[PDB]
Design a protein around this ligand. Structure first.
Ligand SMILES: CC(C)[C@@H](NC(=O)[C@H](CS)NC(=O)CCC[C@H](N)C(=O)O)C(=O)O
Ligand SMILES: [Fe+3]
Length: 328
């Protein structure tokens, strides 16, 4: 199979000052978050045509030499400082997906978290400007564009839960956010390497197994090829594609801080032999950010869950995800 109910929510009021309109958006976010857990944000104001075209030009023009120079430590032992940021290589005949991950552009050598060598903070690596003109400028601008959309969404989630609109957004700051952009290429391959196809317990051929996201929320642009499925009690359901909207879901940090009132939906990626793009922005807070858990089901909102520092959550969650679902 069946198809998931994934509503399209006009999020434009979240950028404005009509408070009643904001509440009507928040109600729709609440409804979706308590149902399948996914919704499409529409009327978001981001030029997703330029995003997809510039990402395609990068993926199609980068060479093996450049990939080694940008590779994370899993693929290049020389790059001990690149655990998150850099290029994640495909393995011809074995691993189809490749991607490029970048972090907060404000993470420079002058940044105190970099000076202190705090885990999960890294300085971005970029290709040579003369080989990829304008790519770094585009990607950094995009980070702030999607940061802005994400800030607005976080106001909607706060209002949906009965909190003041800055409840989450006050911890989502340009100077310290651990948020990341990943530019993922899923290629068309003929023949397609069987090693890159996993078989689910229910027989479905997959590119990436079931998981909960390591994030507060995930803000995803994908090209118009259906691939995602969400788990419900009655089985997995297909999420329809829409290459004009952003697909939104909660990560496991939201589930923790709400005592599972907004669950982190379990989802997986079906195998499809088609050239496509998957461009997630993982909304992460700062390393020291802590939100006191609460339970919206209780009159008093009391929760017995321990507050969890975002940095420790993220460090543990990224490693766990690699261990469970494989090095991407
Ligand atoms: C969506 C995408 N899946 C993914 O990106 C999967 C599951 S959400 N996520 C990851 O591998 C975590 C990337 C974290 C990133 N390197 C960072 O340091 O922040 C897909 O299409 O496979
Ligand atoms: Fe995911």
């Amino acid at each position: 199979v069946s198809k998931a109910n994934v509503p399209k929510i006009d999020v434009s009021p979240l950028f404005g000052d009509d408070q009643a309109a904001k509440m009507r958006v928040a109600q729709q976010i609440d409804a979706a978050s308590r149902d399948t857990g996914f919704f499409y944000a529409v009327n978001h104001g981001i030029n997703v045509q330029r995003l997809s075209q510039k990402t395609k030009e990068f993926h199609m023009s980068i060479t093996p030499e450049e990939k080694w120079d940008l590779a994370i430590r899993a693929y290049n032992k020389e790059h001990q400082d690149q655990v998150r940021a850099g290029y994640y290589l495909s393995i011809p005949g074995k691993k189809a997906v490749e991607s490029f991950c970048y972090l907060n552009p404000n993470f420079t050598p002058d940044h105190p978290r970099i000076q202190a060598k705090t885990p999960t903070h890294e300085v971005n690596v970029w290709p040579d400007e003369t080989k990829h003109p304008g790519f770094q400028d585009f990607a950094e601008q995009y980070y702030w564009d999607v940061f802005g959309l994400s800030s607005a969404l976080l106001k909607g989630y706060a209002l949906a839960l009965g909190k003041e609109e800055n409840f989450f957004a006050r911890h989502f700051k340009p100077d310290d956010t651990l948020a990341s952009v990943v530019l993922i290429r899923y290629p068309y391959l003929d023949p397609y390497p069987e090693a890159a196809i996993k078989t689910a317990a229910d027989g479905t051929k997959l590119s990436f197994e079931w998981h909960e996201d390591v994030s507060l929320i995930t803000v995803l642009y994908q090209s118009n090829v259906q691939n995602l499925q969400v788990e419900t009690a009655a089985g997995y359901q297909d999420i329809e594609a829409d290459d004009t909207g952003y697909l939104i879901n909660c990560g496991s940090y939201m589930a923790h801080l709400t005592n599972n009132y907004y669950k982190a939906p379990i989802h997986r990626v079906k195998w499809v032999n088609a050239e496509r793009q998957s461009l997630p922005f993982f909304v992460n807070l700062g390393y020291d950010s802590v939100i006191d858990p609460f339970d919206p089901r209780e009159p008093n909102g009391k929760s017995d869950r321990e507050p969890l520092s975002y940095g420790d959550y993220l460090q543990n969650g990224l490693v766990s995800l690699i261990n469970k679902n494989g090095q991407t």
